[PDB]
Curated annotation (Swiss-Prot):
Binds 2 calcium ions per subunit. GO terms for cellular component: extracellular region. Residues 7-279 form the Peptidase S8 domain. It comes from Parengyodontium album (Tritirachium album). Belongs to the peptidase S8 family. This is Proteinase K. Its EC number is 3.4.21.64. The lineage of its organism: Eukaryota, Fungi, Dikarya, Ascomycota, Pezizomycotina.
Amino acid sequence: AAQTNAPWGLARISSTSPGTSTYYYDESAGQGSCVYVIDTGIEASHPEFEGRAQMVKTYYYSSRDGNGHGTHCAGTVGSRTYGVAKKTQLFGVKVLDDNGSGQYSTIIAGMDFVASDKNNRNCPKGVVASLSLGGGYSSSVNSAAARLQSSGVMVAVAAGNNNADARNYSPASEPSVCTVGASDRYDRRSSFSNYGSVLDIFGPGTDILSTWIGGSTRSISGTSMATPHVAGLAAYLMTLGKTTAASACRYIADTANKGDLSNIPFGTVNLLAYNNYQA
Ligand SMILES: [Ca+2]
Ligand SMILES: [Ca+2]
């Protein structure tokens, strides 16, 4: 299948070179996989989700996304027009309030929730979690991410938007998960993206168009935007049977576009997520 006039980041992960505008993908489109979006929530009634999204847990007074971040990033995972894996099932877990903030104790509880809730869901091709959040280093937050990964969930996390070494941020600095940096449409590291030896992969992160609350759309930038491209790609590749939750991050790094990015400091991987699609 091919989506013409696609958002640049979708086209970028289906191409060996920048500057294309078609997103090529296998029709299976992540069907049978499930992706938890752990964020501000999901506006599940947005037409772009086609009924494939639902809120399963909130830690505040409502389940509604009053912010937009969670709806945006879920749309990059699996909305019809803006998503990588267009037939996946999306579950929302609201660990951030409508101002986009959350306590570490709540974030940890949300990850432990996913590790157990997945056992109650029908996800025959596997389970992914997308965490576009982060803050200062916390061994307790890292441990919670490691637990989620160990339980059988492919965990993708943002490297952070500080233009610094990701070793000082959590859960980015936890080695056992998939830590995602951000790139722009000209194959430069996004000027805000963290770096360091703990990064596993880069994905598109500058000027990412996706769903927004109020049934709308908008374009925003961050490593928070890059992470759902990798989460969607993992769900897409697990549905195809090419990899599992335990090895998906390694498989994506193995099959990435290598050496394409500019302004990558020595010691950081030069790997850009790529779906290797051949019609
Ligand atoms: Ca290339
Ligand atoms: Ca890693």
